[PDB]
Design a protein around this ligand. Structure first.
Ligand SMILES: *Cc1c(COP(=O)(O)O)cnc(C)c1O
Ligand SMILES: *Cc1c(COP(=O)(O)O)cnc(C)c1O
Lengths: 403, 403
């Protein structure tokens, strides 16, 4: 049987050889990996989860195990609306909540609901790889905007929007991981958040704010989600239980205008019918009964030291010519090497010295920048982080000699 | 803000006004609903689920709560391969297993992976509404084939395939809910299953066998899944825990040739990253430790009486001119009224008399047959079923008078 002849056009394109190649290197024996994107299992509130699971099965079995609505388990959606309104002072008048099988599904749904081939969509450069993967399927025109210490360069965005306007072109969506960005670790300043919203009205586009780390600030001044400043529904906010509960439940939520939620709901129905109800019932109690609020500080207390250890090790071992972001939360740090260095090609040399990272090329729509890398500090203890950074520094010193 | 201007072409099309209209009628006060498609909560093995959940959280917390692979939790996939091989004597050489967020996701993935606009796909007439919904998004050309007491009319399929061949057209996929069909309740005979496979080789197409009720036969002679006769990978088998464990976990699985699984895996990654791991770990123990095999007989024992009550009530109260299928398992029965009767229009009259059903028009790609309906017997007790059928019979007697 020739199976290839059955595949659709989009299926013929998609492939994952490069992710397999990277996994092969990262999993090599005797390698300290700083290339992961996973939360630390020590942060999973297992005892709390066990207690709630039992509670749900004893008092809410039928609703927790039966098919649910596509929009999502109402008690959870209501608890999330209340929690968000309170924690971020979000104007809720034009806000409705729907749950999704992880924020990832929201990304795919945003693609289905808003993107026609060729539609211009703005993403940061670099940006979340899974977002690029989700949107690319819909073949939009990717417009990338650089970042700096204060996140997306909204000044450059405005210039690009004007240029596009003059070309009779329009941007439908501006996608931003506004706080503790994956992969850069930078955070959009409040002044830029307000400006982005102004631009959204001026150039009439919608903002997709991915907020997976909104609850994980370890230091610096709080930066309210862009959604907090949204009074009309210009922002589609994506939250997730992945980093504040556990990735396993595959439960995320979308806070947006009813008109958008209804469309996303219709699109979701044919994809998976509903988000898993058992996990939703558990998340319901987790949020409504105060467990989430009690656990967040514990997560911060666990990650902060690892964040500090990585920044301290970089300062201690990295040679001159190397720069890195200073994340005030989240799980990632971006390291930038001198121009001319290809961190993808240097990978095997890093692995040879016992360390792994994610070559930065992948986080760029066109994979045009090659001297950066993403490091992770959540998954490994402080000493391992230091040893890992030490090995990476030697790798870099040697790479710098090549040319 | 004019949100409509942002919606994609496909988003502009999709809508759910008719499902809302039906839900409105079904939920009317004082109505016995035979229009549901849900398993009975009494069949959920709650105590077993509670025990396994605790076990998983005490002994496998990290793997049950952390992000999983897109292909699926290996211990579960291996247990499913073993269980299937044993229970259905499936030739496993060219079979690999991947888990999905319910079989529904498999349907969407099959659409993404195999269907280009205009591609001919065969479905039974009637067929599973959610399947039509999943495939339609990909705009294929629906080719429908009638059913009879022994399922899909494979003789008619062959004639249609020949006609298409002569037209230079080819069918990529033949989708069939081979056992205890939703909505008809009929089952494809073993002779037709073997013939369908022969045709798959002769006309070179792939078979998607949806087997949500493969484990729920209450009477009659066992009919092995079409997959049991597949030695080369012509069949993509879809199983689900929805009717044998609980719909809430949103865990289904796909048993197919590695080449197809790999493509589906790539497509799934950008949709939701992975199926929820917590539910997968629970399903793993449920299957591997023998719970599933012990529970199946209990489900059969619970549903069989309800199946019998509905068939007995139809025979007792239905007027001459009314026919219905005699399901040997599953959850549905198809009732056919005299030509000229529109069960969609009769709906409000049925609701007025205290009973609801699903007008059959929806289960047809073009919604061209209007004298049928789908009844469900799993969700309500025997006496309620009889009272419901009694009210439906009076509704029909009166409808027959109209013209
Ligand atoms: C961690 C993360 C997510 C979460 O994805 P889920 O599908 O909810 O697990 C989303 N966006 C970014 C930027 C992340 O790094
Ligand atoms: C019940 C049913 C399913 C199961 O769907 P899930 O997404 O696994 O819950 C699939 N196909 C048909 C024909 C069914 O009636």
């Amino acid at each position: 049987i020739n199976f290839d002849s059955f595949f659709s056009e989009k299926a013929m394109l998609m492939k994952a050889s490069e992710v397999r190649e990277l996994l092969k290197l990262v999993e090599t024996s005797d390698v300290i990996s700083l290339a992961g994107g996973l939360p630390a299992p020590e942060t999973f509130p297992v005892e709390t989860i066990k207690k709630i699971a039992v509670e749900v099965l004893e008092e809410h079995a039928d609703k927790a195990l039966q098919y649910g609505t596509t929009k999502g388990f109402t008690p959870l959606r209501l608890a999330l609306a209340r929690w968000m309104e309170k924690r971020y002072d979000i104007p809720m008048s034009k806000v409705e909540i729907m749950t999704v099988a992880g924020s990832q599904q929201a990304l795919d749904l945003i693609g289905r609901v808003f993107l026609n081939p060729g539609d211009p969509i703005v993403v940061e450069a670099p940006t979340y790889l899974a977002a690029i993967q989700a949107f690319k399927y819909y073949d939009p025109e990717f417009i990338s905007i650089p970042l700096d210490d204060k996140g997306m360069r909204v000044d450059l965005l405005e210039e690009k929007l004007e240029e596009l306007r003059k070309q009779g072109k329009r941007v439908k969506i501006v996608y931003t991981v506004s706080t503790f960005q994956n992969p850069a670790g930078v955070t959009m300043s409040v002044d830029r958040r307000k400006k982005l919203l102004e631009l959204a009205n001026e150039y009439d586009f919608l903002i997709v704010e991915d907020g997976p780390y909104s609850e994980l600030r370890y230091s610096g001044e709080p930066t309210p989600p862009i959604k907090h400043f949204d009074d009309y529904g210009r922002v589609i906010y994506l939250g997730t239980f992945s980093k504040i509960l556990a990735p396993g439940f595959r439960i995320g939520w979308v806070a947006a205008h009813p008109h958008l939620i209804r469309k996303m709901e219709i699109a979701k129905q044919s994809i998976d019918l509903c988000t898993n109800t058992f996990g939703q019932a558990i998340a319901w109690k987790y949020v409504e009964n105060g467990y989430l609020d009690e656990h967040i500080p514990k997560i911060i207390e666990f990650y902060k030291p690892r964040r500090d250890a990585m920044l301290e090790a970089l300062e201690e071992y990295m040679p001159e010519g190397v720069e890195w972001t200073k994340p005030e939360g989240g799980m990632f740090v971006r390291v930038t090497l001198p121009e001319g260095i290809d961190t993808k090609l240097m990978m095997e040399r890093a692995v040879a010295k016992g360390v792994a990272y994610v070559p930065g090329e992948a986080f760029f729509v066109h994979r045009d920048k090659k001297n950066t890398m993403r490091l992770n500090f959540t998954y490994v203890p402080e000493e391992t982080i230091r040893e890992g950074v030490r090995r990476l520094a030697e790798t870099i010193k040697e790479e710098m000699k090549r040319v």
